[PDB]
Amino acid sequence: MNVPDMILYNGKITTLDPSQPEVSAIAITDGLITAVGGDELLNSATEKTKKIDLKRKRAIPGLNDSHIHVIRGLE
């Protein structure tokens, strides 16, 4: 496991992975999901890793399709 660019933890994340349909944390490196799980993912973080405490909130992947642009920056 490489040092991830970002780790979101302490949340509710649906994965669409029959093995573990729901996790509380996910690690992202170069735009790719490198790990999913719980607080233990934090063991991979260094000073360069950005961390987001989801504060028990649900988290879902941003709409990502080649035919639609998701307008960001509103409110």
Next chain:
Amino acid sequence: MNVPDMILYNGKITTLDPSQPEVSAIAITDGLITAVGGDELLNSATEKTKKIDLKRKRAIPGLNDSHIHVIRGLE
């Protein structure tokens, strides 16, 4: 024997499984994902399983939260 209620196949489906971030088919049994993969999932289907040929459309989970209402039926 485990039989899914619905099987969406021949599409593009993003998952948060690091080992399989993109599949073309997903199986659903009473509201939960039972399996993901390719058209081999259709071998698990039976007369009762609803099957949807995504015709290469991207499949995304609909907004599913008690605080959100998805407005249906707009043309």
Next chain:
Amino acid sequence: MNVPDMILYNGKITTLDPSQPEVSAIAITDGLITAVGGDELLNSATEKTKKIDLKRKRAIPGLNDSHIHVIRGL
């Protein structure tokens, strides 16, 4: 005079209308949004209009694009 088929009210709705970026109600007629605003929309209803209380939920148009299939079975 137009009477909407449906009115979704008491919600939180973004419009992309600079005049009123957020409203609490929307009126639907033959699949089209024919009005946006607040509770005053309910004055346009008749017994045939279906009124739905959004219960303060944030209401978002369903994603409808020919290239996307929104899974509703979950």
Next chain:
Amino acid sequence: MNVPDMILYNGKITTLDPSQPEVSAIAITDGLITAVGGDELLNSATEKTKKIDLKRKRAIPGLNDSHIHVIRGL
């Protein structure tokens, strides 16, 4: 004085404005929609305003709710 921070144009943009349900461009100023319309919106841009050609893509507002975190960066 007050200039747009971003301008998306040449796309397909649905608005909940009954009088103008569909536009191809929108102007965003400090998180707020300032204007909607066509290519003419580019005339309101300075050099600091970020501009994006949607290349005919459909543009949809991002999910913005305090109960949900939209994972960015893929």
